[PDB]
Structures are given as structure tokens and as C-alpha cells.
Amino acid sequence: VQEIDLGLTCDMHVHVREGAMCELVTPKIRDGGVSIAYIMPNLQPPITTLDRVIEYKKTLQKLAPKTTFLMSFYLSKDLTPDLIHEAAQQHAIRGVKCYPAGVTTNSAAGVDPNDFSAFYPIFKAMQEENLVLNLHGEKPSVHDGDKEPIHVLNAEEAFLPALKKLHNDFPNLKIILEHCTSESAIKTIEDINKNVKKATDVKVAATLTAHHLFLTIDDWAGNPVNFCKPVAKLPNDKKALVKAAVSGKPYFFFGSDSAPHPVQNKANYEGVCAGVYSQSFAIPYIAQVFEEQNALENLKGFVSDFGISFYEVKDSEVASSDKAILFKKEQVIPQVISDGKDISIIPFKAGDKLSWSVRWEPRL
Amino acid sequence: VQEIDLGLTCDMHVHVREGAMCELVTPKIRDGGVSIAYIMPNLQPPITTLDRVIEYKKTLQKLAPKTTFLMSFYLSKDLTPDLIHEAAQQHAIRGVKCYPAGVTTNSAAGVDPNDFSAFYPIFKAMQEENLVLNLHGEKPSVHDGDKEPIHVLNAEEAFLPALKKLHNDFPNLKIILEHCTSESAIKTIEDINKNVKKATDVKVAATLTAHHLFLTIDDWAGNPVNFCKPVAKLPNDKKALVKAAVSGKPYFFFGSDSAPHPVQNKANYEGVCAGVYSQSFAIPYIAQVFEEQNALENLKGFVSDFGISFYEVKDSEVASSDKAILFKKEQVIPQVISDGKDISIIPFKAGDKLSWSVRWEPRL
Ligand SMILES: [Zn+2]
Ligand SMILES: [Zn+2]
Ligand SMILES: [Zn+2]
Ligand SMILES: [Zn+2]
């Protein structure tokens, strides 16, 4: 079987939830072929306190002893600059994730984004402390006047001006447009990094999920199991993300947005929960695209190199120095992922064949 | 004003199924304020023979005597121009309805819209007998990658060329573009009727549903109840359909497309059935749209006159010359339409209030 060494792999957008769900999915981070995981904080309630995030990281480290965990705060009106500084100095967090209110699950009441000026004290303190501003780029939907009607298809593109203002008001702050879905957003990321030579110049990057390199609007319309925010869009949008994923540019790297929901949460007739679960076969999904694209020698940077560089992951904090190795062994995706009790999750592309699997090799 | 005499109301797109479902639904045609209802032909199996269409027509009449029924054939390959003449002369069918294969419910027995040519002998006979060609304007999806992509959002615009073909080759065959959903579809019907004013001149018309005058993509994104085919598109498309509804022009009239499924066919995690139920409150729905647009002087034309003028409904067939009186009593839409036995339906706008009601009054 043909194999590739990938080193310390990166998933900079992981949802892992609480409770018995968190105990089922957290070990599957390693099973997906991921050594370093950036944990998003949209919990119930959102993680806004310094106590919470210290307790939470140890819960994950008890669950996954070999996986590196970069934590984050939920951007709320609760946070104050001192809390940013004390948490950053204790290595409690690595960034703060911003949720526009009413545009995804666990996000209300979060922030108003045709604004952001209210949180400039926080961005001041994050900029000083080298933290990362993760943005769920989506303007909340307003349909009437005065301005343009905003819907699930232009919500990401309508947000882009606000991302441009933030990069100008805080040029030295690290910002990420999380999970890109539209070609207009891709063009904006390239344009912001127009002059950039070598990766350490990148201050504004974009992450790309596994499922948005596969899905279009047709795959989720009438299929709540492919429903997520931001919505998978037109075929030309998908072509852009796939082109961007294989491009080998240092401002696009992997972030699954693996968001587990029990199957009863997805089989509603109103109010379907949003989020696709890709944790269990994370890198095997991505290697499938790159093989299909005949660009495998760029995969090493998309799932490992470009992300460590951006988040400045030093060897010292990494929980284990084992490498993730793909090997071309064909496997079939289960119908369900389940704890054998109350929680059963439907995996992305369930019942399909993948060319690669993942094992782990120590360092010598 | 409160109380408006509507006369003989027209719903030129009604789904009633069979079995225990039909016994809950066909009484609600009357309940919704509809006296004349066109019945669609997609059953298990599709309605294609004179035996079934007449026995269907007869079971309908035992379950709702006062309702006038206009019946239809499924456009299947098991059809002959002989079968057209032997059903048109024996006053059994008012038209034949074209289903593209795979796009919607029970459409697996449908047709391939990239080549209508095999059915040209059928449309030749349908033109001879002054029958109505009901078209579900939607090309089936083509991921392709070579030729242009066809998806659920642009499938209606893709069908519009094929319709301007059918109108050139059968210039006297009465054709309807069923449930319009896009501004491209509306502009085309305006362009086809460049020079008509009143009213029997229209041979290519377009029917508009209740829910498509309400819904945008945001309303069915994570709400399977509001998922139907063709899908509800963008706010610029809804504005076009509303402007064309309170238009007062003869080529737009009412066709609810009330398609009922048992709620368990909606609360699926994949493969959710398509179709919204609106038969129980069909006329009060449209009444609220025509009220909120300050164009109630056009409700009678949209929901009665133009539909009668196109199908040329004669006095000699209407099952009950009772009049639909729309009176302004507030009513609340139930959570669940129920039969006390097995079948449970979720109605359109379930829970919401309506500004109007409708009762029945005989002519005297
Ligand atoms: Zn998000
Ligand atoms: Zn997320
Ligand atoms: Zn249809
Ligand atoms: Zn229909």
C-alpha cells in the first residue's frame, strides 16, 4: 500500500460539545488523523469565563491524552480586557471565536456584526497578546429594506466588508475567516494577501471544511444530514474552494467544522440542527479530494504545515510527537457513529468508500 | 372592506393522494374555500388509464360532492394519442401533467426534458382536443462539470428555453408553467404575452402557489415542512411572484400545489419528501397576501376569474354553484392536521394567525 507521511496534522475548527457526546467524539479526533485540535466554545452556556476554559481543556486531555488542544473564548459582552490578558498569560486560550447572533446554532445572543466597534477594547488586548480572531463570516439575515436582502446564500459575501475593516483597524491582529463557502470570499482572501511572500507574513487566513469540498446546494436541500452553517452553495463556489484547497497558498488551511448532532436532532420536521460530523475520517476525507485532484504533494501543508505556522504551534505544547501516516487502504464509512447508549451520529458521506486510512508512527 | 364575494374559486393544482390520506384531504378542498379544483395524477402507480382516472374521479365525488373535480393524466411513456381522444371525448381528463424524472415526489415514472420529441405525437392530440398541458418546469440536476451545472436553484430557469420551444411548435395548445418560483420565469411569461389584454387569448399561462408567495430559501433551509419542488428561491424572486400575483393580468392565477405527506415523511435526516400542505386554508392564505399588498380588488380575478377563463369552465359541470364568501374573522392555523387514526399532516404556517376566514353561501 502506498503511503504518505504528514507529520503533526491540524484541525483548526473542532466542535466536541459536552457530556456523553464529548466522551464519544473527543477520542475520534485522533482516529481522524489529527494531532492538534482548535476547540470552538459555542457551549450551553458559551465559554466566557477563565474558570470554564481551564476546566474544559483538562476534561478533553483526560479524554484524549495524546491530542494537542488549543482552546478559545466565545466573544461575548461579558469579556473585559483584563480577562483577555490574564487568560493569555496563563496559556488558557489561543484565540476568540466570534459568532454573529442568529445565524448558526448556539450563537444567540452573541454579537451584532455590522458593528464590531463595541469589541475593539477586546481586539486591542488580543492583538497585544498574539491571540487569533476566528470569524464565522455571515451577516445575519435581514430581508426587507433599507439595504440589500440578506439570505443564506449571500450572508457570507455580505459579511466580507466587515472582515476588511477589521484587518485595517487592527493590521497586526491575526484574523481567520472560518469555513469559507463562496468564491467571492476566496478572492477576498487572496487579495488581502496579494504581496505576501513566505507564510510568516500572513495575518488574515481562511479555513476550509471537509464537507464544503464535496457538497453543493443540491446535496443538502432535502437532506438535513448535509445541513450546516454556512450553507454549501453553488457548484462554482465549490470549484473555488477545491481550487483554493489544493493551491498550496499559506492562507488556506484545514478546519473541519465537525459538529456532532444526535440523529434525533437532525430528523426534525422544523428547526433542523446545523452541523456535519467529519471528525471520524477527517484527513481521509481530505486526501480523497487531493487524490481526485491529482495534487497530493500539496496536502501536507493544508492539513499540517500552514496551520501550525499561523497559530504558532511550538513543539513544546504539543501533547504527542507521533506522526499521521496515510496509507492507501480502502475503507467504508459506517452508517452511524454511536456510544452504544443514547447518542448516535450520522457520519459525512456514510456508506461511501475512501482510498486512504490513517495510522500513527512515533518519532525517532 | 370586510366580506368579499369570490364566487366559484379556482385551485388549478391540487394533490389528494389516495387511501386514508384522500379521506382526510378531499373534504378540505371545500374547507379551504375552493369549489373548483384541478387534480394532479402522481399516485402509486401513476394515473394513466381511463379505468383509474374515472374511478378516482368517482371516489373523489363520494368524499366531497359539492367540490368540482377536473382530472388529469400522468405524462408517461405508457400513453397513446388514441388514449387522448378516447378520454377527451368521454369527458374524463382536462389535461396531462408533465413530470420530469426524479425531481419530486412520485416523479420516478417521469420524462426526460432534454428530449420531449417522443411525446410530440401526444401534444399533437392534446392540441386537437383543446386540452391543457401542465408543465412542472424543472430540468433534473446535472453535476456534470463539462456542460453547465443544473441545480435546484436554477433548474426552473433552465426549463424556460424548452417551454419557448413547446410554444412555437404547438401555438394553440393551452400550456401552463406550473408553480412559478423565479423572476426569470415571470419575465418569460410576461414576454410570451407581449400583446394580450383580456383574457381568453392567453394560451401560455402560469400558476402561482400560496407558499411561494411567502417563502424564501431561508424558510426551508432547516425546516423540512417548507421544502417543496421547485424550491423557494431568493427574495428578488419572491418579489417577482408577489408583483405577478396581485398583478391583475390574466396569465397568472392560483394553483396551491398543496401536497400532503404524513409528518414522518418530513422528519427525516435524509431524503425528506417534498411538498407543502395548504389545502385546509388555501384561500385565506392568498387573501392575506392580497391584503398586505393593498390590492384586494384583484383577489377575485387571481383566485377565480382568470383560472375559469383559461380552463373554460362551463356552467354545465360545476358540482355546486355555491359562492365562496371571504369574511374577515381571525383564525389560528393548527399545529397538526389530524385524522384521529394514522395520518398526521403539518399545515403551512402552522401556528400563525390569519386575517381572514371563508364560509359558503348558495346563489339564490
Ligand atoms: Zn461557523
Ligand atoms: Zn463551527
Ligand atoms: Zn410540481
Ligand atoms: Zn404539485
XYZ file of C-alpha atoms and ligand atoms in Angstrom:
732
model
C 0.000 0.000 0.000
C 1.276 3.445 -0.987
C 1.740 5.813 1.944
C 2.449 9.458 2.793
C 3.931 10.939 5.969
C 2.089 14.079 7.093
C 3.693 14.956 10.439
C 1.680 16.879 13.039
C -1.747 17.330 11.470
C -4.052 20.276 12.168
C -7.814 20.736 12.519
C -8.354 24.384 13.468
C -12.166 24.136 13.774
C -13.434 21.354 16.047
C -16.733 21.074 17.893
C -16.812 18.431 20.600
C -19.709 19.519 22.849
C -20.272 18.463 26.484
C -21.304 15.381 28.376
C -21.602 11.885 26.930
C -21.359 13.342 23.430
C -17.969 14.847 24.303
C -16.772 11.452 25.551
C -17.736 9.751 22.267
C -16.248 12.253 19.812
C -13.073 13.510 21.507
C -11.091 10.241 21.058
C -12.219 10.221 17.413
C -10.042 13.308 16.865
C -7.008 11.012 16.963
C -8.867 8.417 14.884
C -9.414 11.049 12.197
C -5.651 11.514 11.937
C -5.418 14.805 13.830
C -2.704 15.679 16.354
C -3.664 19.309 17.099
C -7.262 20.472 17.546
C -8.570 24.018 17.994
C -11.679 23.720 20.169
C -14.559 26.107 19.488
C -16.556 27.274 22.523
C -20.231 27.516 21.477
C -21.429 25.560 24.504
C -24.590 25.896 26.615
C -23.796 28.427 28.009
C -20.953 29.739 25.833
C -17.488 29.565 27.389
C -16.901 33.138 28.569
C -15.100 32.626 31.900
C -11.494 31.786 32.720
C -12.581 29.037 35.136
C -14.669 27.252 32.488
C -11.991 27.040 29.804
C -9.384 25.673 32.230
C -11.830 23.014 33.431
C -12.833 22.189 29.852
C -9.313 21.648 28.496
C -8.490 19.175 31.273
C -11.707 17.296 30.503
C -10.531 16.933 26.899
C -6.990 15.986 27.941
C -8.417 13.308 30.230
C -10.370 12.108 27.184
C -7.575 12.357 24.573
C -4.152 12.178 26.268
C -2.114 12.431 23.039
C -4.051 15.184 21.221
C -2.979 18.827 21.428
C -5.797 21.162 22.481
C -5.836 24.871 21.629
C -8.822 26.421 23.399
C -10.824 29.592 22.788
C -13.341 32.001 24.302
C -16.783 32.887 22.988
C -16.861 36.576 22.057
C -19.474 37.949 24.456
C -20.231 41.263 26.144
C -19.024 39.503 29.308
C -15.345 39.660 28.330
C -13.134 42.507 29.552
C -9.533 43.311 28.505
C -8.089 42.132 31.828
C -9.706 38.719 31.335
C -8.048 38.555 27.909
C -4.642 39.352 29.402
C -4.816 37.008 32.399
C -6.126 34.165 30.226
C -3.498 34.734 27.530
C -0.645 34.837 30.051
C -1.797 31.524 31.561
C -1.979 29.908 28.083
C -5.678 29.363 28.797
C -6.702 30.240 25.231
C -5.200 30.773 21.796
C -7.966 32.886 20.250
C -11.528 34.128 20.481
C -14.292 32.923 18.160
C -16.926 35.452 17.083
C -20.497 34.283 16.435
C -22.888 36.688 14.687
C -26.177 36.360 16.537
C -28.906 34.268 14.948
C -27.000 32.728 12.042
C -25.890 29.383 13.488
C -26.537 27.111 16.451
C -25.550 28.214 19.973
C -24.957 31.767 18.709
C -27.752 33.901 20.230
C -27.310 36.239 21.763
C -23.731 36.649 20.621
C -22.676 39.752 18.673
C -24.039 42.184 16.088
C -21.570 42.221 13.186
C -22.488 45.328 11.177
C -20.878 46.940 14.212
C -17.883 45.165 15.839
C -16.808 48.598 17.122
C -18.080 47.608 20.574
C -15.440 44.875 20.949
C -12.441 46.985 19.918
C -11.138 47.008 23.536
C -11.050 43.205 23.290
C -9.361 43.234 19.877
C -6.798 45.652 21.329
C -5.949 43.147 24.062
C -5.976 40.162 21.690
C -3.657 41.976 19.272
C -1.174 42.613 22.089
C -1.398 39.007 23.311
C -0.925 37.308 19.893
C -4.361 35.642 20.042
C -6.399 34.764 16.946
C -9.771 36.228 15.949
C -11.859 33.459 14.375
C -14.831 34.819 12.427
C -17.990 32.978 11.421
C -18.299 35.208 8.374
C -22.050 35.650 7.919
C -24.237 38.744 8.136
C -27.493 37.962 9.994
C -30.407 37.747 7.593
C -32.442 40.901 7.007
C -34.851 40.575 4.098
C -36.633 43.931 3.703
C -35.099 47.395 3.426
C -33.277 49.568 3.646
C -30.223 47.670 2.430
C -29.816 44.541 0.303
C -31.884 41.483 1.308
C -29.565 39.103 3.169
C -30.166 35.353 2.889
C -28.292 32.101 3.468
C -26.572 32.415 0.082
C -25.158 35.956 0.266
C -24.746 36.122 4.060
C -21.082 35.115 3.811
C -20.311 37.543 0.983
C -22.238 40.417 2.585
C -20.027 39.988 5.670
C -16.713 40.410 3.765
C -16.656 44.235 4.122
C -16.593 43.853 7.916
C -13.624 41.478 7.683
C -11.897 44.104 5.529
C -12.486 46.805 8.151
C -11.055 44.620 10.926
C -7.845 43.902 9.000
C -7.446 47.679 8.551
C -8.298 48.790 12.097
C -6.113 46.010 13.588
C -3.425 45.229 10.996
C -1.163 43.220 13.325
C -4.020 41.102 14.712
C -4.359 37.525 13.466
C -7.803 37.025 11.909
C -9.305 33.931 10.274
C -12.428 33.773 8.133
C -13.669 30.391 9.322
C -15.032 27.758 6.917
C -15.167 29.522 3.550
C -18.022 28.580 1.226
C -18.119 31.200 -1.568
C -15.813 32.209 -4.409
C -16.197 35.894 -3.531
C -14.762 35.098 -0.096
C -11.842 33.191 -1.635
C -10.998 36.106 -3.941
C -11.004 38.425 -0.924
C -8.540 36.233 0.975
C -6.119 36.183 -1.964
C -6.456 39.951 -2.394
C -5.710 40.700 1.268
C -2.582 38.537 0.862
C -1.601 39.991 -2.514
C 2.021 40.973 -1.794
C 2.671 38.236 0.768
C 5.970 36.368 0.477
C 6.612 33.383 2.812
C 3.985 32.174 5.267
C 5.003 34.272 8.281
C 3.601 37.374 6.534
C 0.041 36.003 6.667
C -2.163 37.798 9.194
C -5.590 37.026 7.668
C -6.236 33.447 6.536
C -9.216 31.213 5.779
C -10.008 27.653 6.841
C -11.906 25.128 4.726
C -14.094 22.284 5.962
C -14.062 18.761 4.587
C -17.713 18.731 3.539
C -17.677 22.029 1.620
C -15.145 20.498 -0.789
C -17.885 17.961 -1.621
C -21.339 19.444 -1.101
C -23.367 21.850 -3.210
C -26.864 23.202 -2.578
C -28.317 20.057 -4.156
C -26.670 17.693 -1.666
C -28.266 19.338 1.394
C -31.620 20.543 0.021
C -33.941 17.808 1.230
C -31.047 16.186 3.128
C -30.794 17.643 6.654
C -27.754 15.443 7.347
C -25.742 17.682 4.988
C -27.149 20.882 6.531
C -24.621 23.227 8.124
C -23.743 26.892 8.537
C -22.526 28.382 6.360
C -24.642 26.613 3.765
C -22.990 24.660 0.959
C -23.596 26.799 -2.096
C -23.394 26.786 -5.897
C -21.115 24.492 -7.941
C -18.913 27.462 -8.860
C -18.435 28.183 -5.157
C -17.363 24.569 -4.608
C -14.945 24.751 -7.547
C -13.339 27.786 -5.904
C -12.820 26.142 -2.508
C -11.346 22.994 -4.070
C -9.037 25.097 -6.244
C -8.119 27.059 -3.113
C -7.579 23.917 -1.028
C -5.033 22.452 -3.470
C -3.484 25.841 -4.269
C -0.663 25.497 -1.746
C -1.080 29.091 -0.603
C -0.207 29.676 3.074
C -3.509 31.433 3.899
C -5.796 28.412 3.374
C -5.650 25.511 5.829
C -7.945 22.814 7.140
C -10.683 23.218 9.740
C -13.392 20.584 9.669
C -16.237 22.351 11.488
C -17.064 18.814 12.580
C -20.204 19.497 14.637
C -21.814 16.374 16.119
C -25.584 16.215 16.488
C -27.541 13.133 17.592
C -29.643 11.783 14.747
C -32.823 12.871 16.539
C -31.570 16.463 16.288
C -31.181 16.156 12.502
C -34.502 14.403 11.763
C -36.787 17.258 12.748
C -39.602 18.473 10.532
C -38.951 22.058 11.678
C -35.774 23.562 13.089
C -33.194 21.070 11.843
C -29.933 21.368 13.761
C -26.962 22.568 11.714
C -23.574 20.876 11.534
C -21.854 17.994 9.732
C -19.754 15.384 11.553
C -16.457 14.687 9.767
C -14.190 14.114 12.788
C -14.007 10.328 12.461
C -12.454 10.367 8.961
C -11.137 13.953 8.818
C -7.874 13.547 6.885
C -9.197 10.528 4.888
C -11.900 12.853 3.522
C -9.315 15.481 2.581
C -6.891 13.032 0.962
C -9.786 11.857 -1.221
C -10.173 15.341 -2.714
C -6.449 15.835 -3.303
C -6.103 12.405 -4.927
C -9.128 13.146 -7.126
C -7.440 16.482 -7.880
C -4.022 14.877 -8.548
C -2.355 17.336 -6.179
C -1.372 15.080 -3.282
C 2.009 16.731 -2.720
C 0.201 19.909 -1.576
C -1.912 18.076 1.029
C 0.901 18.165 3.602
C 0.571 21.931 4.025
C -3.226 22.107 4.036
C -3.701 19.664 6.938
C -0.489 20.418 8.849
C 2.151 22.930 7.771
C 0.165 26.100 7.076
C -1.895 25.823 10.269
C 0.946 25.295 12.739
C 2.719 28.239 11.107
C -0.294 30.525 11.517
C -1.338 29.535 15.041
C 2.367 29.440 16.054
C 2.185 25.930 17.493
C 5.525 25.279 19.194
C 6.772 21.725 19.709
C 6.730 22.198 23.482
C 2.947 22.419 23.876
C 2.167 19.519 21.519
C 0.865 16.633 23.577
C 2.459 13.900 21.457
C 5.068 13.837 18.683
C 3.563 10.930 16.747
C 3.089 11.406 13.011
C -0.077 10.852 10.993
C 0.547 8.497 8.061
C -1.915 7.938 5.245
C -1.843 4.512 3.626
C -3.847 3.642 0.534
C -6.107 1.050 2.172
C -9.749 1.216 1.122
C -12.393 1.517 3.835
C -16.148 2.064 4.074
C -17.822 4.765 6.165
C -20.132 3.368 8.895
C -23.855 4.070 8.757
C -23.754 5.515 12.292
C -21.241 6.542 14.939
C -22.583 5.746 18.383
C -21.672 5.301 22.043
C -23.904 2.224 22.242
C -26.262 4.109 24.561
C -28.218 7.271 23.716
C -26.049 9.104 21.158
C -25.823 8.047 17.506
C -24.293 10.421 14.943
C -24.516 10.076 11.159
C -21.046 10.464 9.587
C -20.397 12.553 6.496
C -20.654 10.509 3.279
C -21.913 7.494 5.215
C -21.722 4.267 3.231
C -19.062 5.516 0.801
C -15.598 4.165 0.025
C -12.385 6.059 0.766
C -8.980 5.301 -0.714
C -6.890 6.112 2.373
C -6.740 5.234 6.060
C -4.576 6.666 8.847
C -2.196 5.110 11.392
C 0.300 6.672 13.808
C 4.109 6.435 13.855
C 6.346 7.719 16.678
C 9.342 9.992 16.064
C 12.969 8.708 16.185
C -63.910 46.099 3.117
C -64.843 43.076 5.228
C -66.641 40.241 3.397
C -65.744 39.765 -0.290
C -67.768 37.605 -2.680
C -65.373 35.346 -4.597
C -67.883 33.135 -6.421
C -66.531 29.875 -7.833
C -62.945 29.605 -6.592
C -60.178 28.056 -8.699
C -57.297 25.909 -7.422
C -55.579 24.684 -10.593
C -53.050 22.423 -8.817
C -54.327 20.057 -6.108
C -52.749 16.913 -4.642
C -55.032 14.486 -2.806
C -53.248 11.079 -2.883
C -55.420 8.017 -2.159
C -56.139 5.685 0.782
C -56.731 7.021 4.273
C -54.957 10.187 3.115
C -57.548 11.124 0.486
C -60.367 10.789 3.030
C -58.724 13.469 5.195
C -57.828 15.768 2.305
C -60.611 15.957 -0.279
C -63.112 17.252 2.326
C -60.613 20.068 2.981
C -60.722 21.363 -0.595
C -64.200 22.588 0.337
C -62.958 23.645 3.782
C -60.206 25.803 2.304
C -62.648 27.895 0.274
C -62.163 26.071 -3.042
C -65.067 24.901 -5.207
C -63.202 24.108 -8.456
C -60.036 22.048 -8.005
C -57.724 20.521 -10.612
C -56.479 17.088 -9.519
C -52.879 16.018 -10.304
C -52.027 12.486 -11.436
C -48.976 11.243 -9.464
C -50.018 8.146 -7.498
C -48.650 4.650 -6.873
C -48.965 3.743 -9.715
C -49.319 6.917 -11.826
C -52.788 7.556 -13.244
C -52.569 6.645 -16.935
C -55.679 4.605 -17.858
C -59.329 5.533 -18.322
C -60.430 2.979 -15.715
C -58.434 4.538 -12.886
C -58.935 8.222 -13.719
C -62.707 7.729 -13.710
C -62.774 5.514 -10.617
C -60.506 8.114 -8.997
C -62.920 10.829 -10.140
C -65.775 8.820 -8.625
C -64.192 8.098 -5.238
C -63.436 11.822 -5.050
C -67.128 12.627 -5.504
C -68.350 10.319 -2.732
C -65.938 12.069 -0.341
C -66.804 15.644 -1.426
C -69.974 16.149 -3.510
C -70.036 19.962 -3.589
C -66.462 20.112 -4.942
C -65.991 20.206 -8.717
C -63.175 17.953 -9.934
C -61.090 18.361 -13.099
C -58.868 15.348 -13.707
C -55.536 14.728 -15.404
C -53.309 12.063 -16.951
C -49.732 11.338 -15.956
C -47.290 12.071 -18.769
C -45.810 8.579 -19.033
C -44.377 6.538 -21.886
C -47.393 4.200 -21.494
C -49.612 6.698 -23.330
C -51.001 6.889 -26.860
C -52.661 9.608 -28.952
C -55.515 7.093 -29.098
C -55.847 7.237 -25.315
C -56.078 11.031 -25.561
C -59.041 11.056 -27.955
C -60.903 8.311 -26.070
C -60.611 10.232 -22.780
C -61.155 13.743 -24.164
C -64.402 12.824 -25.932
C -65.726 10.859 -22.939
C -65.176 13.935 -20.702
C -62.724 12.336 -18.283
C -59.488 14.358 -18.467
C -58.919 18.106 -18.655
C -55.212 17.750 -19.429
C -51.988 15.829 -18.999
C -49.293 16.778 -16.471
C -45.584 16.513 -17.308
C -43.327 15.248 -14.511
C -39.550 15.308 -15.018
C -37.929 12.155 -13.700
C -36.563 12.311 -10.163
C -37.116 15.974 -9.309
C -40.082 15.495 -6.988
C -42.445 13.068 -5.271
C -43.586 10.043 -7.315
C -41.797 11.558 -10.320
C -39.584 8.482 -10.806
C -42.007 7.491 -13.593
C -41.405 10.854 -15.279
C -39.947 12.150 -18.526
C -36.586 13.412 -19.772
C -36.928 17.150 -20.532
C -33.774 17.275 -22.666
C -35.776 15.380 -25.331
C -39.540 15.953 -25.444
C -39.626 14.723 -29.034
C -41.092 11.274 -28.331
C -44.158 12.950 -26.794
C -44.776 15.224 -29.788
C -47.487 12.844 -31.117
C -49.185 13.232 -27.722
C -49.108 17.040 -27.652
C -50.455 16.925 -31.219
C -53.565 15.106 -29.972
C -53.783 17.258 -26.833
C -53.867 20.327 -29.085
C -56.624 18.800 -31.229
C -58.863 18.265 -28.187
C -58.166 21.679 -26.577
C -56.648 20.054 -23.503
C -54.277 21.677 -21.005
C -50.544 20.908 -20.821
C -49.449 21.169 -17.181
C -45.652 21.548 -17.051
C -43.511 21.107 -13.941
C -40.755 23.346 -15.269
C -37.541 21.939 -13.800
C -34.630 20.208 -15.507
C -33.149 17.348 -13.450
C -29.857 18.072 -11.740
C -26.582 17.770 -13.669
C -23.413 17.980 -11.584
C -21.571 17.205 -14.849
C -18.589 19.555 -14.892
C -18.458 19.622 -18.701
C -21.673 21.366 -19.741
C -23.245 23.993 -17.425
C -24.365 22.855 -13.950
C -28.081 22.466 -13.263
C -29.067 22.706 -9.596
C -32.238 23.142 -7.553
C -31.779 26.918 -7.563
C -31.531 27.359 -11.354
C -33.479 24.332 -12.621
C -36.590 26.422 -13.324
C -34.700 28.992 -15.401
C -33.130 26.086 -17.305
C -36.559 24.796 -18.377
C -37.665 28.136 -19.852
C -35.938 27.502 -23.232
C -37.763 24.175 -23.599
C -41.067 25.957 -22.955
C -40.440 28.591 -25.636
C -39.824 25.610 -27.916
C -43.109 23.915 -26.968
C -44.995 27.179 -27.548
C -43.526 27.583 -31.046
C -44.387 24.040 -32.169
C -47.876 23.910 -30.580
C -49.065 27.523 -30.863
C -52.687 26.722 -29.935
C -52.121 24.054 -27.266
C -53.025 25.510 -23.870
C -49.898 25.361 -21.698
C -49.312 26.379 -18.084
C -45.954 26.883 -16.408
C -46.861 25.317 -13.071
C -45.817 26.868 -9.735
C -43.509 29.691 -10.797
C -40.700 30.359 -8.327
C -38.238 32.718 -10.056
C -38.158 36.149 -11.664
C -36.709 34.575 -14.816
C -39.901 32.516 -15.081
C -42.123 35.568 -14.575
C -40.269 37.758 -17.086
C -40.668 34.982 -19.656
C -44.438 34.684 -19.213
C -44.650 38.471 -19.481
C -42.562 38.216 -22.653
C -44.726 35.436 -24.100
C -47.859 37.534 -23.502
C -46.445 40.713 -25.023
C -49.677 41.814 -26.680
C -52.615 40.178 -24.856
C -55.121 42.086 -22.749
C -58.249 40.195 -21.664
C -58.119 37.212 -21.209
C -59.124 34.212 -23.255
C -56.220 34.993 -25.602
C -53.695 33.551 -23.147
C -52.600 30.082 -24.233
C -49.382 30.013 -22.179
C -50.265 30.881 -18.580
C -48.506 30.445 -15.246
C -49.908 29.318 -11.907
C -48.683 30.648 -8.559
C -48.888 28.804 -5.246
C -49.703 30.049 -1.765
C -46.404 29.156 -0.113
C -44.252 30.530 -2.937
C -45.713 33.994 -2.234
C -44.332 33.671 1.327
C -41.175 31.581 1.375
C -37.531 32.275 0.667
C -34.624 29.834 0.848
C -34.122 30.887 4.475
C -37.544 29.494 5.399
C -36.886 25.920 4.202
C -33.135 25.778 4.936
C -33.586 23.859 8.186
C -37.374 23.444 8.113
C -38.393 20.333 6.138
C -42.059 21.391 6.312
C -41.329 24.255 3.905
C -39.275 22.144 1.472
C -41.108 21.686 -1.832
C -40.300 21.438 -5.525
C -39.464 23.745 -7.115
C -37.621 25.086 -4.065
C -38.367 28.549 -2.709
C -35.677 30.791 -4.166
C -34.398 34.317 -3.347
C -36.156 37.477 -2.095
C -35.817 39.051 -5.542
C -37.700 36.014 -6.860
C -40.445 36.228 -4.221
C -40.923 39.927 -5.003
C -41.445 38.993 -8.657
C -44.013 36.309 -7.806
C -45.912 38.672 -5.492
C -45.908 41.505 -8.034
C -47.180 38.970 -10.581
C -49.809 37.666 -8.144
C -51.510 40.974 -7.312
C -50.801 41.832 -10.946
C -54.355 41.526 -12.233
C -53.012 40.208 -15.545
C -54.918 37.199 -16.924
C -51.920 34.889 -17.399
C -51.290 34.423 -13.648
C -53.791 32.608 -11.423
C -53.927 30.320 -8.405
C -52.582 26.792 -8.014
C -51.930 25.858 -4.401
C -49.774 22.765 -5.060
C -50.990 21.569 -1.644
C -49.065 18.279 -1.487
C -49.692 16.308 1.726
C -47.238 13.855 3.284
C -47.510 12.178 6.692
C -45.244 14.044 9.087
C -42.907 11.034 9.347
C -42.014 11.626 5.682
C -40.789 15.104 6.711
C -38.889 14.439 9.957
C -36.174 12.528 8.102
C -32.441 13.069 8.373
C -32.055 12.386 4.639
C -34.435 12.069 1.716
C -37.171 14.315 3.082
C -40.296 14.260 0.931
C -41.045 17.462 -0.970
C -44.344 19.328 -0.801
C -46.199 21.778 1.453
C -49.766 21.238 2.665
C -52.059 24.247 2.293
C -55.441 22.844 1.213
C -57.139 23.444 4.571
C -56.645 27.228 4.337
C -55.949 27.673 0.619
C -57.997 30.833 0.002
C -57.288 32.572 3.364
C -53.562 32.293 2.566
C -53.844 34.228 -0.706
C -56.268 36.656 0.951
C -53.580 37.771 3.400
C -51.035 38.386 0.633
C -53.561 40.442 -1.335
C -54.454 42.336 1.853
C -50.865 43.140 2.879
C -50.282 44.472 -0.661
C -53.376 46.748 -0.660
C -54.607 45.061 -3.848
C -57.683 43.161 -2.696
C -59.659 44.346 -5.737
C -57.589 41.784 -7.672
C -58.173 38.747 -5.437
C -61.296 37.572 -7.274
C -59.536 37.650 -10.638
C -56.472 35.785 -9.382
C -58.351 33.170 -7.355
C -61.344 32.712 -9.680
C -61.888 34.505 -12.979
C -58.636 34.025 -14.908
C -58.472 30.360 -13.899
C -62.001 29.769 -15.173
C -61.284 31.766 -18.331
C -58.242 29.622 -19.183
C -59.694 26.189 -18.419
C -63.011 27.452 -19.891
C -65.052 26.012 -17.037
C -68.648 25.831 -18.246
C -71.719 26.089 -16.036
C -72.705 22.571 -17.124
C -70.094 20.840 -14.921
C -69.677 22.823 -11.681
C -70.692 20.462 -8.887
C -72.234 23.218 -6.733
C -72.842 26.845 -7.727
C -72.292 27.915 -4.122
C -70.185 31.047 -3.689
C -67.037 31.449 -1.590
C -67.582 34.373 0.795
C -64.311 35.602 2.313
C -65.096 37.233 5.672
C -62.556 38.868 7.965
C -62.699 36.615 11.037
C -59.320 35.875 12.598
C -58.378 32.208 12.758
C -55.306 30.422 14.105
C -53.707 27.702 11.985
C -53.492 24.362 13.864
C -50.262 22.699 14.936
C -51.148 19.364 13.322
C -53.891 18.409 10.897
C -55.058 15.031 12.154
C -57.470 12.227 11.292
C -57.585 10.546 14.716
C -56.204 7.381 13.091
C -52.805 7.198 11.367
C -52.180 10.148 9.058
C -50.907 13.415 10.564
C -50.036 16.495 8.497
C -48.295 19.755 9.376
C -50.050 22.671 7.631
C -48.380 25.658 6.026
C -47.660 28.405 8.575
C -48.709 26.052 11.377
C -49.423 28.175 14.442
C -49.660 31.528 12.693
C -52.816 33.632 12.641
C -54.796 34.607 9.550
C -56.664 37.859 8.979
C -59.462 36.088 7.087
C -61.841 33.140 7.053
C -64.210 31.790 4.405
C -67.747 30.377 4.568
C -70.172 29.010 1.970
C -73.285 30.691 0.567
C -75.563 29.442 -2.236
C -76.528 31.668 -5.176
C -80.375 32.137 -4.721
Zn -19.433 28.572 11.826
Zn -18.094 25.756 13.889
Zn -44.620 20.363 -9.251
Zn -47.685 19.636 -7.453
